[PDB]
Amino acid sequence: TVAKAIFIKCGNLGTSMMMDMLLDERADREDVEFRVVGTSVKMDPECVEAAVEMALDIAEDFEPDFIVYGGPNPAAPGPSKAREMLADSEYPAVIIGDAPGLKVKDEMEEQGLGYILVKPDAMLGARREFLDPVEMAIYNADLMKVLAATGVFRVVQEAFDELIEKAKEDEISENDLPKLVIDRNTLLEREEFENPYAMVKAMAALEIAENVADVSVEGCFVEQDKERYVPIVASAHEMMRKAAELADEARELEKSNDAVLRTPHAPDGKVLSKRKFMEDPE
Amino acid sequence: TVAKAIFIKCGNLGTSMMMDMLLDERADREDVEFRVVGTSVKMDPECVEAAVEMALDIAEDFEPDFIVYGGPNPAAPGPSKAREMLADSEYPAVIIGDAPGLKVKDEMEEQGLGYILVKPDAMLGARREFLDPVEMAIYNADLMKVLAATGVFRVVQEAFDELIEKAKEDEISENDLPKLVIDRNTLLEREEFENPYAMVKAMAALEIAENVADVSVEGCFVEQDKERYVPIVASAHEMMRKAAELADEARELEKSNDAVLRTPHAPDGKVLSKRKFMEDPE
Amino acid sequence: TVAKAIFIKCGNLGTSMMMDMLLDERADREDVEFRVVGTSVKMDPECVEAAVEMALDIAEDFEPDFIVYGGPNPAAPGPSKAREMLADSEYPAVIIGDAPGLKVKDEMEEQGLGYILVKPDAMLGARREFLDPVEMAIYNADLMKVLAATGVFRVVQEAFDELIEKAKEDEISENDLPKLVIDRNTLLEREEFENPYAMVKAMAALEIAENVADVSVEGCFVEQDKERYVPIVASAHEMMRKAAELADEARELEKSNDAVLRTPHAPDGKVLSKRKFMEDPE
Amino acid sequence: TVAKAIFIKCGNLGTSMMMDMLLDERADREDVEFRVVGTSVKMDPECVEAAVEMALDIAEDFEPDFIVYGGPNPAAPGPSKAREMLADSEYPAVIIGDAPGLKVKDEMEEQGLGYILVKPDAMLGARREFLDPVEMAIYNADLMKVLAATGVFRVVQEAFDELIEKAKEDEISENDLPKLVIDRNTLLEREEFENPYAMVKAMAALEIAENVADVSVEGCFVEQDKERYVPIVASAHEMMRKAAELADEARELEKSNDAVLRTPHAPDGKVLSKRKFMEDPE
Amino acid sequence: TVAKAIFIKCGNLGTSMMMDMLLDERADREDVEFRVVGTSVKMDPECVEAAVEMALDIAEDFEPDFIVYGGPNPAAPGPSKAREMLADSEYPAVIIGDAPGLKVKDEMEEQGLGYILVKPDAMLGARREFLDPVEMAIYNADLMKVLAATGVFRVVQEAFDELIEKAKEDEISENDLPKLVIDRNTLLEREEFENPYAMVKAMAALEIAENVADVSVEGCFVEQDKERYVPIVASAHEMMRKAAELADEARELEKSNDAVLRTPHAPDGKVLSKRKFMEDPE
Amino acid sequence: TVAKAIFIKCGNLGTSMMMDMLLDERADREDVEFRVVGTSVKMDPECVEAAVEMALDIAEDFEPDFIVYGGPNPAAPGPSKAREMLADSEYPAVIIGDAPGLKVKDEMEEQGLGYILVKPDAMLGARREFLDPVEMAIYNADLMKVLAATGVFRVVQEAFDELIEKAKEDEISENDLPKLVIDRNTLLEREEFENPYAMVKAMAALEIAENVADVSVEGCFVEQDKERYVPIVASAHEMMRKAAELADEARELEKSNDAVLRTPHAPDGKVLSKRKFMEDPE
Ligand SMILES: [Ca+2]
Ligand SMILES: [Ca+2]
Ligand code: NA
């Protein structure tokens, strides 16, 4: 059976940027087919409607098993309109978002939607005097390192791989939809790291990453004096850079014990596992 | 006047992943509107045709001024199908690709296509024993850091901003389409870095990134013994990690002189410029 | 004139450890004389009363111009007794504390006490399974680096040097007593750093150090499962370690421009200033 | 059974700064009670005398089992007065000092004093043109890191804990007083590091720290031209900063093996021990 | 029996610089005696003939078992003259060189010469505007780190130790002469590294080192505009600096597992082996 | 005129290993010609006599203007024999050595010999259990980095370039011969570093490097228990590794200001100078 999904991307988060690719890292899965649509970085209600409309138009002929909407702040006007359209639709849907999405977590459950809210997927320092395209990309690189090397992306991979398997025995029910909130403490319930200091360095990374969001918000939405807000937003980016270095330190620790967890997909979609470098994944 | 474009993403490159977002880094441009479609990681001919078809379907109503196709290896069967379908459409089109795209550079010119071929946008170590989703994301984080902090993304940003300006006075002709090959030596014709060591560090980063591709190719397509190819692909990833460190080093040098170039967009899409941290961009 | 003060140390904070020594870094000031008393790490009401009583007993013959009480949490039972005793006494007094001291800020003003509340002076991960003497000392080393290299200790130095000068013209009144709250944003009102990236790195360090306190508090007072709280408190120490790296990075940036601010005391107590390595302080 | 001690602190050493705190790292020991008195950084005879007087004064009511004097250069005039007064008193006493103390080691034996002479507890670069309060604090941060992560502070904790246990059966004789000289080679007789490379790095750190003293002495007491002495004393601080990095590297090697020794006190004062992160100390 | 050899050094390579010393690292071998002659950095035909004539002049009385010629580019005019002269002589001879020596590999076999060609022994950025004595030495320090810490020097040591053993059993034949080409992939056939990430980091270092040569060649021999060639040659040196960092990182990983391979010579020349720091070599 | 010299190398020092190559870094000097002879690492009296005899034999035809003997410890039996032979000869001679050479400094002046004694050129940890060929090469890489990046090699370059120019006007007299002792404080009389922190970091590196020798000497010649001497010699190597890192940091600070001193030779042997990366040396 081939599971089918549409991913809708409006605005940008680290998680929404990678979410589809985490499911087919070598493009060799024979049990999935995806379509990805969006309006790039714009996430006003008009653009989001356009994005969802594209999805639903494609869905008529594509017949996806589920639809994923990903981007910043599920509580905002654009995303709320996506939640409304997708909840109304015939397709099971999952909302990928960040910490501001916690405001509408009960509402999403009421709407019959799944969610994965990634608290460390922090808003960047979006002031013109600081954030140009290069800086935006630098931040995203650091963030992606954090989300990957800490194990957060493996949490997201697993949630969708479970959903996909349910899709393969058809009708995914509301009870099958992910309802996850990911943060520093998520690592406490997992066995990502063989070395306890790699895990605590990864937790520190995630804490810092989550703390970045409040600094960005202060600099973007509260502070009005540029002599203050430019340094504030830039400090958030320095924090993210060091979160990434901690994530890197954690991963090097694992390397030192030849204990880096890898969980690749087989061509039939089965999630394999290994820890030793030269061990075949099984 | 609002420029419209559709971006098509099949497969993954560092450049293709970021290309649309580099043009509207704070989502505050009023002079652009984009649609993004694709088939995620899959870039076989059937997937690519489905992607291009989605794009052209949307184009009927959206009326883009140009269309961008981005992904690995323009010379491969899937991308070759996109090039012909795009070349045969009524829309001006640009192909974003990597070093393997040089093999069809003359063909693309004959097809009346633009291109941006990014030689440091190197193929990763795509063997199951090594590349899981997390490793894939870690590699992409390092690469993004390289392409951003070396100034490659600014080269791309500028090529598209120039094209967008032409789109607004409307007559985008073949002569207007970008025809760029980016590598280490690209930096020699730019003024990215105030500090010359920053520039040479960045050139080293790009050279290393470019050399990554040959290691990955050997590991994925030539070497057939896993006791050899797993170490080979893994070594490519260690190289990219150090390319990203050099890119970071270069950026910190610019910080030490308060000379980090920032070129943000104004709401009307004008590209602004600054070097000093507290200087307003203009 | 020779200014005289008694410093009372109950419990440990980075600022209270160093506060007296910041005022006479080479022991060559001829205009000050200090006594230091305390009960080491213990700050229960009984110990604190014993400490303050030692101070007041010495004060009879020493005749200090002011008395400083330093240590964790001004709102806690032990420190609350010291505030009560000092507010009752004839001596002007200043309370050095941390962020939990904010709860009794208005109370302290009503008591006629000065205060310097250092938000980044974060509680450590005080769980027996993790915190041994060596770890305690390690954390203190990281914290002292942060508070020093970010400029916090210069803010404290200044506040006391001003108070000392007022002591030297007799009338220390309640209006002369410091009323400071120090955090990340304190740097925005200062000219500590010649380089703006050094400043924002230092801000990031202070932000992280401040965030350490919440992690420690969660791990020490809220989380009851050791499988959880041991990793949590450890992760707070990993964060502090990186805050110290950031502060180091900032100082090295200043080195690179030969612009490290130094403000040493002359033998008569005047605070001198220099930036250039070979420049005489004046 | 509660052991009581008074600590006297005149001038500043890394070891004297932390000595009392290393004995009750979470303030939960129920078998100890301490008083700490001193004259801050000043250690001329009249200051040290005042300090010892405060101690003896408090002793009459407090009834300590022993008295500890800590600070620079036991052979200097001020500390020599402390040694004389303490030797003459009815209280067992221990002198904490640095390498210059070796000159009066036999004398202290003849006086019936204990001692802990810490050779890597190096004098800093005390020239006005270089040493302000911030630099002094940064040097202290690096030294504290060195003495803590090398295991020197654990040698000190143990000496005192053995002494405290003897105090609890009343019979502290002169034969029970510590007589330690601590340097790089001290690590060879210890079991501190599971990893041999961590041990040798720690050894290297302590060697560099010890050698700092010679550079400081040269810069402060021999060289008289500021064009030479300012760079000399600064070079000493750069050495200490790298000694601290070596000690941190060693600690990170222990974390890679999950073998970081921790020896926390129980509430009853028993010294517990563990290596694995998640294991209870016993 | 005492094996005797003459080493001829014209020009400089990392391998030629160290080759003799790798065979008697503490000068305590009783079974070898070497002479070293050369013309320093100059390797034009006239200089090389002079060097070889010095060797053969000494060889008349010294009676070496073999002769080694080491320096850059076996295929160049100077080295070609050394090959011809040595092939003609009565003495078995080995040519140490770099990747450009591959062009005359079959020729060397035909001449009855041995060779060790070290591809990562890359030409430096020899342009007057960049390469001064200090820069040359810095590059050599980085290269030496690479060749040593990756295990390349161990491969060279082994090759000569085998040849020396054959020298000691009177007859060296043409079949005993080494015929080695060393690169990144050489490590795949060895057991240098206990940790697989140390191995792949060492492979990355060797790959980058080998890629340096192409950048140097482009900068020295192809690019004729100084505005371009100076940055190009400089970027080659930045690449070798990071190759050395990777090599260092690999060695530290081995330290973290107490697994650093050591193969010292015994006084009788036997090559011993150990991994554990405190294990006697045997 | 073409100046001629013979370099004799017996044993190994960082300075002796590089000394001839520092004088002709690109092999393009037309005003010098060198011969290099030696007995590799062996420096017992018979070996050294053989070495010097080779040199004198060559000198009869080569007619050098001066002769350089370089290697460890001028005061040892082997080197003392070279000094005697060279002093007796018709050729001006310079002795390159290390700190132990200071013992025979006056003797060398009485002999009419020049010397360059490099105190930071420290003996390594030559115990079989630790020092294999690889470790020997690693140490030499670190030492070379220290001697190069601190500017020590530039001091040696200049001393020989002066002597060479005097050789070109026939009169090499005893007064012309270098008489240098190089150590940390040598930097104070130079203008090597534009940045004063680069200088002090370099001074720190040289201090540490010089301190290495005492540790090596303790481990190789005093300590007799291998449980002690193996760690001791290994710690010396850890120290040299950090000295190299300090030297690296110093050089990077110079890069951050575009102020790296370069002094290349012109083809006529004139020593040029520049600081800015893109400025021609003059
Ligand atoms: Ca056409
Ligand atoms: Ca007195
Ligand atoms: Na597992």
Coordinates of N, CA, C and O in Angstrom, one line a residue, chain B residues 118-210:
Chain B
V118 N 25.0 25.8 -8.6 CA 25.8 26.1 -7.4 C 26.7 24.9 -7.1 O 26.2 23.8 -6.6
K119 N 28.0 25.0 -7.5 CA 28.9 23.9 -7.4 C 29.2 23.4 -5.9 O 29.2 22.2 -5.6
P120 N 29.3 24.3 -4.9 CA 29.3 23.9 -3.5 C 28.1 23.3 -2.9 O 28.1 22.9 -1.8
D121 N 26.9 23.3 -3.6 CA 25.7 22.7 -3.2 C 25.7 21.1 -3.4 O 25.1 20.6 -4.3
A122 N 26.5 20.5 -2.5 CA 27.1 19.2 -2.8 C 26.1 18.1 -2.4 O 25.5 18.2 -1.4
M123 N 26.1 17.0 -3.2 CA 25.4 15.8 -2.8 C 25.9 15.3 -1.5 O 27.1 15.1 -1.3
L124 N 24.9 14.8 -0.7 CA 25.3 14.2 0.5 C 25.6 12.7 0.4 O 25.4 12.1 -0.7
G125 N 25.9 12.0 1.5 CA 26.3 10.7 1.6 C 25.2 9.7 1.7 O 25.0 9.1 2.8
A126 N 24.5 9.5 0.6 CA 23.2 8.8 0.6 C 23.3 7.3 0.6 O 22.9 6.7 -0.4
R127 N 23.7 6.7 1.7 CA 23.7 5.3 1.9 C 23.0 5.0 3.1 O 23.2 5.6 4.2
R128 N 22.1 4.0 3.1 CA 21.2 3.6 4.2 C 21.9 3.4 5.5 O 21.3 3.7 6.6
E129 N 23.1 2.9 5.5 CA 23.8 2.5 6.7 C 24.3 3.7 7.5 O 24.6 3.6 8.7
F130 N 24.3 4.9 6.8 CA 24.8 6.1 7.3 C 23.7 7.2 7.4 O 23.5 7.8 8.4
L131 N 23.0 7.4 6.3 CA 22.1 8.5 6.2 C 20.7 8.2 6.6 O 19.9 7.6 5.9
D132 N 20.4 8.6 7.9 CA 19.0 8.6 8.3 C 18.5 10.0 8.2 O 19.2 10.9 7.8
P133 N 17.2 10.2 8.7 CA 16.7 11.6 8.6 C 17.5 12.6 9.4 O 17.7 13.7 8.9
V134 N 17.9 12.3 10.6 CA 18.7 13.2 11.5 C 20.0 13.6 10.8 O 20.3 14.8 10.8
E135 N 20.7 12.6 10.2 CA 22.0 12.9 9.6 C 21.8 13.8 8.3 O 22.6 14.7 8.0
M136 N 20.7 13.5 7.6 CA 20.3 14.3 6.5 C 20.1 15.7 6.9 O 20.5 16.7 6.2
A137 N 19.4 15.9 8.0 CA 19.1 17.3 8.5 C 20.4 18.0 9.0 O 20.6 19.2 8.8
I138 N 21.2 17.2 9.7 CA 22.5 17.8 10.2 C 23.4 18.2 9.0 O 23.9 19.4 9.0
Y139 N 23.5 17.4 7.9 CA 24.2 17.8 6.7 C 23.6 19.1 6.1 O 24.4 20.0 5.7
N140 N 22.3 19.1 6.0 CA 21.7 20.3 5.4 C 21.9 21.6 6.3 O 22.0 22.7 5.7
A141 N 22.0 21.4 7.6 CA 22.3 22.5 8.5 C 23.7 23.1 8.2 O 23.9 24.3 8.1
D142 N 24.7 22.2 8.1 CA 26.0 22.6 7.8 C 26.1 23.3 6.4 O 26.7 24.3 6.2
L143 N 25.5 22.7 5.4 CA 25.5 23.2 4.1 C 24.9 24.6 4.0 O 25.3 25.5 3.4
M144 N 23.7 24.7 4.7 CA 23.0 26.0 4.7 C 23.9 27.1 5.3 O 24.0 28.3 4.9
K145 N 24.6 26.8 6.4 CA 25.5 27.6 7.0 C 26.6 28.1 6.0 O 26.9 29.3 5.9
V146 N 27.2 27.1 5.3 CA 28.2 27.4 4.3 C 27.6 28.3 3.2 O 28.2 29.4 2.9
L147 N 26.5 28.0 2.6 CA 26.0 28.8 1.5 C 25.5 30.2 1.9 O 25.6 31.1 1.2
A148 N 25.1 30.3 3.2 CA 24.7 31.6 3.7 C 25.9 32.5 4.1 O 26.0 33.6 3.6
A149 N 26.7 31.9 5.0 CA 27.8 32.8 5.6 C 28.9 33.0 4.6 O 29.7 34.0 4.8
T150 N 29.0 32.3 3.5 CA 30.1 32.6 2.5 C 29.6 33.7 1.5 O 30.4 34.2 0.7
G151 N 28.3 34.0 1.5 CA 27.8 34.9 0.6 C 27.1 34.3 -0.6 O 26.6 35.0 -1.5
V152 N 27.1 33.0 -0.8 CA 26.5 32.4 -2.0 C 25.0 32.7 -2.1 O 24.6 33.0 -3.2
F153 N 24.3 32.7 -1.0 CA 22.9 33.0 -1.0 C 22.6 34.4 -1.4 O 21.6 34.7 -1.9
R154 N 23.6 35.3 -1.1 CA 23.4 36.7 -1.6 C 23.6 36.8 -3.1 O 22.9 37.6 -3.7
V155 N 24.4 36.0 -3.7 CA 24.5 36.0 -5.1 C 23.2 35.5 -5.7 O 22.7 36.1 -6.7
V156 N 22.6 34.5 -5.1 CA 21.3 34.0 -5.6 C 20.2 35.1 -5.4 O 19.4 35.3 -6.3
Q157 N 20.2 35.7 -4.2 CA 19.2 36.7 -3.9 C 19.2 37.8 -5.0 O 18.2 38.2 -5.5
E158 N 20.4 38.3 -5.2 CA 20.6 39.3 -6.2 C 20.2 38.9 -7.6 O 19.6 39.8 -8.3
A159 N 20.4 37.7 -8.1 CA 20.0 37.3 -9.4 C 18.5 37.3 -9.5 O 18.0 37.8 -10.5
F160 N 17.8 36.8 -8.5 CA 16.4 36.8 -8.5 C 15.8 38.2 -8.4 O 14.8 38.5 -9.0
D161 N 16.4 39.0 -7.5 CA 15.9 40.4 -7.4 C 16.0 41.2 -8.7 O 15.1 42.0 -9.0
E162 N 17.1 41.0 -9.4 CA 17.2 41.6 -10.7 C 16.2 41.1 -11.7 O 15.6 41.9 -12.5
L163 N 15.9 39.8 -11.7 CA 14.8 39.2 -12.5 C 13.4 39.8 -12.1 O 12.6 40.0 -13.0
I164 N 13.2 39.9 -10.8 CA 11.9 40.4 -10.3 C 11.7 41.9 -10.8 O 10.6 42.2 -11.3
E165 N 12.8 42.7 -10.8 CA 12.7 44.0 -11.3 C 12.3 44.1 -12.8 O 11.5 44.9 -13.2
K166 N 12.9 43.2 -13.6 CA 12.6 43.1 -15.0 C 11.1 42.7 -15.2 O 10.4 43.1 -16.0
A167 N 10.7 41.7 -14.3 CA 9.3 41.2 -14.4 C 8.3 42.4 -14.2 O 7.3 42.4 -14.8
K168 N 8.7 43.3 -13.3 CA 7.8 44.5 -13.1 C 7.7 45.5 -14.2 O 6.7 46.2 -14.2
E169 N 8.6 45.5 -15.1 CA 8.6 46.4 -16.3 C 8.5 45.4 -17.5 O 8.8 45.6 -18.7
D170 N 8.2 44.3 -17.1 CA 7.3 43.4 -17.8 C 7.9 42.5 -18.8 O 7.7 41.3 -18.7
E171 N 8.7 43.0 -19.7 CA 9.0 42.2 -20.9 C 10.2 41.1 -20.6 O 11.2 41.2 -21.3
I172 N 10.1 40.3 -19.6 CA 11.2 39.3 -19.3 C 11.5 38.6 -20.6 O 10.7 37.8 -21.1
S173 N 12.7 38.8 -21.2 CA 13.2 38.2 -22.4 C 14.2 37.1 -22.0 O 14.7 37.1 -20.8
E174 N 14.6 36.3 -22.9 CA 15.7 35.3 -22.7 C 17.0 35.9 -22.2 O 17.7 35.3 -21.4
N175 N 17.3 37.1 -22.7 CA 18.5 37.9 -22.3 C 18.5 38.3 -20.8 O 19.6 38.5 -20.3
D176 N 17.3 38.4 -20.2 CA 17.2 38.8 -18.9 C 17.4 37.6 -17.9 O 17.6 37.8 -16.7
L177 N 17.3 36.4 -18.4 CA 17.4 35.2 -17.6 C 18.8 35.0 -17.0 O 19.7 35.1 -17.8
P178 N 18.9 34.7 -15.7 CA 20.2 34.4 -15.1 C 20.9 33.3 -15.8 O 20.3 32.3 -16.2
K179 N 22.2 33.3 -15.9 CA 23.0 32.3 -16.4 C 24.3 32.2 -15.5 O 25.4 32.7 -16.0
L180 N 24.2 31.7 -14.3 CA 25.2 31.8 -13.3 C 25.8 30.4 -12.9 O 25.0 29.5 -12.8
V181 N 27.1 30.3 -12.8 CA 27.8 29.2 -12.2 C 28.5 29.7 -11.0 O 29.3 30.5 -11.0
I182 N 28.1 29.2 -9.8 CA 28.7 29.7 -8.5 C 29.7 28.7 -8.0 O 29.4 27.5 -7.9
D183 N 30.9 29.2 -7.7 CA 31.9 28.4 -7.0 C 32.8 29.2 -6.1 O 32.5 30.4 -5.9
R184 N 33.8 28.6 -5.5 CA 34.8 29.3 -4.7 C 35.2 30.7 -5.3 O 35.2 31.7 -4.6
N185 N 35.5 30.7 -6.6 CA 36.1 31.8 -7.3 C 35.1 32.9 -7.5 O 35.5 34.1 -7.8
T186 N 33.8 32.6 -7.3 CA 32.8 33.7 -7.4 C 33.1 34.8 -6.4 O 32.8 36.0 -6.7
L187 N 33.6 34.5 -5.3 CA 33.9 35.5 -4.2 C 34.9 36.5 -4.7 O 34.9 37.6 -4.2
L188 N 35.7 36.1 -5.6 CA 36.8 37.0 -6.1 C 36.2 38.2 -6.9 O 36.9 39.2 -7.1
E189 N 35.0 38.1 -7.4 CA 34.4 39.2 -8.1 C 33.4 40.0 -7.3 O 32.7 40.8 -7.8
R190 N 33.3 39.7 -6.0 CA 32.4 40.3 -5.1 C 33.1 41.2 -4.1 O 34.3 41.2 -3.9
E191 N 32.3 41.9 -3.3 CA 32.8 42.7 -2.3 C 32.1 42.3 -1.0 O 31.8 43.1 -0.2
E192 N 31.8 41.0 -0.8 CA 31.1 40.5 0.4 C 31.8 40.8 1.7 O 31.2 41.3 2.7
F193 N 33.1 40.6 1.7 CA 33.8 40.6 3.0 C 34.7 41.8 3.0 O 35.5 42.0 2.1
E194 N 34.6 42.6 4.1 CA 35.5 43.7 4.3 C 36.9 43.1 4.7 O 38.0 43.7 4.4
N195 N 37.0 42.0 5.4 CA 38.3 41.4 5.8 C 38.8 40.4 4.8 O 38.0 39.5 4.4
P196 N 40.0 40.5 4.3 CA 40.5 39.5 3.3 C 40.6 38.1 3.8 O 40.4 37.2 3.1
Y197 N 40.9 37.9 5.1 CA 40.9 36.5 5.6 C 39.6 35.9 5.8 O 39.5 34.7 5.6
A198 N 38.6 36.7 6.0 CA 37.2 36.3 6.0 C 36.9 35.7 4.6 O 36.3 34.7 4.5
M199 N 37.3 36.4 3.6 CA 37.1 36.0 2.2 C 37.8 34.7 1.9 O 37.2 33.9 1.3
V200 N 39.1 34.6 2.3 CA 39.8 33.4 2.0 C 39.3 32.2 2.8 O 39.4 31.0 2.3
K201 N 38.8 32.4 4.0 CA 38.2 31.4 4.8 C 36.9 30.9 4.1 O 36.6 29.7 4.1
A202 N 36.1 31.9 3.7 CA 34.9 31.5 2.9 C 35.2 30.8 1.6 O 34.5 29.9 1.3
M203 N 36.3 31.2 0.9 CA 36.7 30.5 -0.3 C 37.1 29.0 0.0 O 36.7 28.1 -0.7
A204 N 37.8 28.9 1.1 CA 38.1 27.5 1.6 C 36.9 26.7 1.9 O 36.9 25.5 1.7
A205 N 35.9 27.3 2.6 CA 34.7 26.6 2.9 C 34.0 26.1 1.6 O 33.5 25.0 1.6
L206 N 33.9 27.0 0.6 CA 33.3 26.6 -0.7 C 34.1 25.6 -1.4 O 33.4 24.7 -2.1
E207 N 35.4 25.6 -1.4 CA 36.2 24.6 -2.0 C 36.0 23.3 -1.4 O 35.8 22.3 -2.0
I208 N 35.9 23.3 0.0 CA 35.7 22.0 0.7 C 34.3 21.4 0.4 O 34.2 20.2 0.1
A209 N 33.3 22.3 0.5 CA 31.9 21.9 0.1 C 31.9 21.3 -1.3 O 31.3 20.3 -1.6
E210 N 32.5 22.0 -2.3 CA 32.5 21.5 -3.6 C 33.2 20.1 -3.7 O 32.8 19.2 -4.4

